[PDB]
Design a protein around this ligand. Structure first.
Ligand SMILES: CCCCCCCCO[C@@H]1O[C@H](CO)[C@@H](O)[C@H](O)[C@H]1O
Ligand SMILES: [Ca+2]
Ligand SMILES: [Ca+2]
Ligand SMILES: [Ca+2]
Ligand SMILES: [Ca+2]
Lengths: 201, 201
């Protein structure tokens, strides 16, 4: 039986937002900004490279339906040209890597779309989801899922750790990445879940 | 209406090998060595990092069954310590990325087991399969599949190119990668397949 591994602010429901105050431009609570190529400036604005939380309700400009989970989704927007680097959000968990364990990391990916006040969100930068142990990427999915404009779709990253793994006992981690492989170059995430179950191995 | 895209030496059937002349330490013909971190030496021996083709019959030392396809499989072996880098095999194809098209890249990943003169092949470095256009990785799977010792399993990488794609007209490519995340640090590949079919959106 698959056991849920606790994640901080896993559905980006913090902070609480309203139809009136419907976004932040700050790293979601419980998450760290991942910016290996320095695309996110020290001084952010809503038009600079940024990440944050967006109230995604039933009358969202950007989606046909409300948030897959709760009220809010996370977003990662990059202003730089295609191919300039990758950036996103990451979180180190308290849980550690166990042998003969199958890990299932599920995340909803959002392709924000439509036109709002005459501006198009048509196009998509792609996505990458990574499961880590320590600072090793154990498993990853980059763009295997196609997401239509104004839709959210669920991707799944799986990994089995064997008794011979070099990473046993190292802290699990998660990264949610915008790889900047298209414009418009915003991608959203919601409802991060991670389970562990016994595996034959 | 799924169209097969030609790949050179896609099953690593070249060169032809015999029971007694059963491996190479040279790059499989039609493929190129992918060595971004310089792990493969200019002059290779059996104990250096290397790659090549191996005959894999129905009574192999390393596998429960014969090669997934034909007589041969490719291998990528890295001698350096876990975490030193990645290497493998890559091929640029004649075909180019086209819009409104779903690409499906299928390849068999092998976890060689058994032993070589009391050198156990127990353990596995992981794998990563990448679909490219030009120099960009469009889509990738790293370690989503678990492969038991002495088995092969099929993985797939899927990508849809939209009309907004920045990579249309660029040549497709394939990379089969040993990410050196474990020892024994050899991983095998066979039966590389790429199809293209109309997609909506
Ligand atoms: C003129 C272009 C400036 C950048 C556009 C606004 C960037 C804000 O970011 C957008 O916000 C939404 C949540 O608020 C998310 O759903 C979108 O994916 C995200 O990219
Ligand atoms: Ca949510
Ligand atoms: Ca979009
Ligand atoms: Ca073969
Ligand atoms: Ca092995």
């Amino acid at each position: 039986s698959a056991v849920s591994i606790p994640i901080k602010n896993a559905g980006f429901e913090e902070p609480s937002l309203t139809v009136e105050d419907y976004y932040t431009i700050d790293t979601p609570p419980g998450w760290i900004t991942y910016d290996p190529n320095g695309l996110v400036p020290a001084k952010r604005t809503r038009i600079t490279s940024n990440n944050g939380v967006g109230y995604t309700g039933p009358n969202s400009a950007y989606y046909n339906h409300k948030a897959p989970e709760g009220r809010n989704v996370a977003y990662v927007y990059l202003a730089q040209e295609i191919g300039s680097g990758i950036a996103g959000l990451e979180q180190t968990l308290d849980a550690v890597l166990k042998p003969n364990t199958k890990y299932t990391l599920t995340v909803d990916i959002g392709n924000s779309g439509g036109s709002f006040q005459g501006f198009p969100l048509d196009g998509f930068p792609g996505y990458r989801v990574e499961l880590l142990a320590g600072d090793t990427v154990l498993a990853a999915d980059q763009n295997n899922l196609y997401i239509k404009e104004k839709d959210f779709k669920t991707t799944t990253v799986t990994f089995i750790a064997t008794p011979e793994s070099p990473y046993l006992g190292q802290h699990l981690g998660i990264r949610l990445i915008n790889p900047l492989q298209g414009k418009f170059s915003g991608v959203d995430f919601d409802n991060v879940r991670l389970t562990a179950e016994p595996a034959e191995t």
